[PDB]
Structure formats: C-alpha cells, structure tokens
Amino acid sequence: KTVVVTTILESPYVMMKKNHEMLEGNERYEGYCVDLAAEIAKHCGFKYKLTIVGDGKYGARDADTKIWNGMVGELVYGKADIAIAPLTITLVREEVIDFSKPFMSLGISIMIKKGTPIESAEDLSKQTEIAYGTLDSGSTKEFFRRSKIAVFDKMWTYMRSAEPSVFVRTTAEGVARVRKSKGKYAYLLESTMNEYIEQRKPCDTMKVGGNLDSKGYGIATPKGSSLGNAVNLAVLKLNEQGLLDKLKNKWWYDKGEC
C-alpha cells in the first residue's frame, strides 16, 4: 500500500512549486523534506503520497478533550503512516508515537530586526520596550510553558499574559512581525529556521546569542508501525553518507539571497 506521508508547509522544508497547478501528486511540492521523503522512501523501498496536514499544526494534546492535533494527531489516529517534517522529538510525543534518531540538530534561538539592542534571552527578560513571542502551538511555546529555569519562566509569564498576543499562527507571520516592528518585536524560534531567514531578502533579520536548548527533529511513525526500524536505519545511513548536510546547504546556503 502507498504510504501516506503527513507534512507541513514550512519553508524551506515543504513549499508549493511555482507551477504546482500544472503538476500532480508529489510533484506539486519542493523543499528539504520533499527531497528527504523521496530518499527515505527509496531506502526503505516504499511508494508514498505526500499530504499537507489538515489543521496546519505540528502536534499537541488538548487537556480536557485529550485529543491530539497536527501531524502527531494524524499518526495517532491513523490518518497518516509517517510524518516527514521539522517535527521536534519531545517526551510527550515519544509517549504516543515513535521517532527515528534526529535528522537535524537545533535549539530555540532569538531573531531580531538588525539593530535591535538585544543579545540574549536574559536581555529580553530584563526589559519590556521590545515585545517578543513564539510560534503559537509548537514545542517552542511548550518549552517556555514548562520551563523551571528562572529566565525562561520569567519570559513565559510575560508572553502568556501579553496583550495583544505575542504568539503567531505561522513562522512567516512571526518574521513579518519582526520585519515591521521597527525593532520593537523579537521572535523566539528554532535555530535552523532563524539561520534560513537570515539568508533571505530583505536581509534585515539576524540570529543573536546562543541557543536556549538543544534538541532534534525526527521522522515520526505511529507506535507499532512496520516502518519504524527501517526508517531509523535510513536516517542514520543518510546522515553518515553526508546527504543531510548536502540538503541543508542546498535549501539554506546554495539558495541564499544575502
């Protein structure tokens, strides 16, 4: 059976091709995760169909309703067989789905409009003129919600109580907000995304300070999946053979506009 792959429209991982209306199926998309999916499939020997997650979310469980949304939910309820996206390997998710070893290492980082007088998370927490937030609904927002580290908890208390909301629906929304704030809005996001945006026109944003944490993105499958073992071995083989480094250069730097 054709393997159903759930993914998310997040540049440069998965994007619509310019003439996608002319194309069909898997040919409608391009990106780092599109290239990765084709390779994982080749190495594991399966045919597949890329589908964009219905609710445009990564994956979180609603307390009360107890229902999982996003790509994680698609795997949990059997709507998809595998998730190939910039999906963070977390404990809460690992309890309901399986993840391959990481295909990309990263950490939460700070994005500023060039010139903003901020060089760390401590800087952000110690002031209030410059607003800041995260991508609503993902692991970055959860990192702050769950943190017991003083600086990060102080940051969470401000963000959750901030009005209007400092949280954004999409990365693009966070980046445009940074770009239009005149330095009055900093954005907390995954490092690899920060580095990508730093190489895109108008070349007016930059990553400052070190990463707030260290983690990774993994390929996810439902628990008990027949694909789990092979998918994991494929990720390790691809990393060892240099393909992963090659894909990042391709979508990040080879195509860099700054």
Ligand X SMILES: N[C@@H](Cn1cc(Br)c(=O)[nH]c1=O)C(=O)O
Residue choice 6, 11, 69, 90 for contact with its own copies (CB under 8 A): 90
The stretch near its own copies (CB under 8 A) out of 37-45, 124-132, 141-149, 185-193 is 141-149
Q: Is 70 left (phi over 0), alpha (psi -120 to 50) or beta?
A: left
Residue choice 44, 96, 131, 233 for contact with its own copies (CB under 8 A): 233
Residues contacting 238, CB < 8 A, separation 6+? 36, 39, 40, 43, 103, 244
What does the alpha-carbon distance between residue 221 and residue 80 come to, in Å, rounded to a whole number?
Answer: 9
Contact 140, 187 (CB under 8 A): no
Residue choice 27, 49, 51, 62 for contact with Zn ion (CB under 5 A): 62
What does the alpha-carbon distance between residue 106 and residue 213 come to, in Å, rounded to a whole number?
Answer: 8
Q: Which is nearer to its own copies, 181 or 239 (CB)?
A: 239
- Does 236 interact with its own copies (rule: CB under 8 A)? yes
- Does 89 interact with its own copies (rule: CB under 8 A)? yes
The stretch near its own copies (CB under 8 A) out of 62-70, 126-134, 165-173, 233-241 is 233-241
Taking the complex as a whole, how short is the minimal distance between the CB of residue 149 and its own copies, in angstroms? 5
Q: Does 88 count as an annotated binding residue?
A: yes
Q: Which of residues 79-98 bind ligand X (CB under 6 A)?
A: 86-88
The stretch near its own copies (CB under 8 A) out of 9-17, 25-33, 96-104, 125-133 is 96-104
Place of tokens 């595998």: 82
Residues contacting 50, CB < 8 A, separation 6+? 5, 7, 14, 25, 26, 29, 34, 37
- Does 22 interact with its own copies (rule: CB under 8 A)? no
Which residues, in sequence order, are bridge partners of residue 160? none
Which residues, in sequence order, are bridge partners of residue 83? 6, 220
Taking the complex as a whole, how short is the minimal distance between the CB of residue 52 and its own copies, in angstroms? 27
Residue choice 109, 244, 247, 251 for contact with its own copies (CB under 8 A): 244
Per-residue HEC secondary structure of 51-117 comes to EECCCCCCCCECCCCCCECHHHHHHHCCCCCEECCCCECCHHHHCCEEECCCCEEECEEEEEECCCC
- Does 191 interact with ligand X (rule: CB under 6 A)? no
Half-sphere exposure of 81 (CA within 13 A, CB side): 17
Residue choice 21, 24, 64, 257 for contact with Zn ion (CB under 5 A): 64
214 binds, among ligand X, its own copies, Zn ion, none (CB under 5 to 8 A by kind): its own copies
Chain residues in the site for ligand X (CB under 6 A): 58, 86-88, 135, 138-140, 171, 189-190, 193
Binding positions are 86, 88, 93, 139-140, 190
Chain residues in the site for Zn ion (CB under 5 A): 39, 62, 64
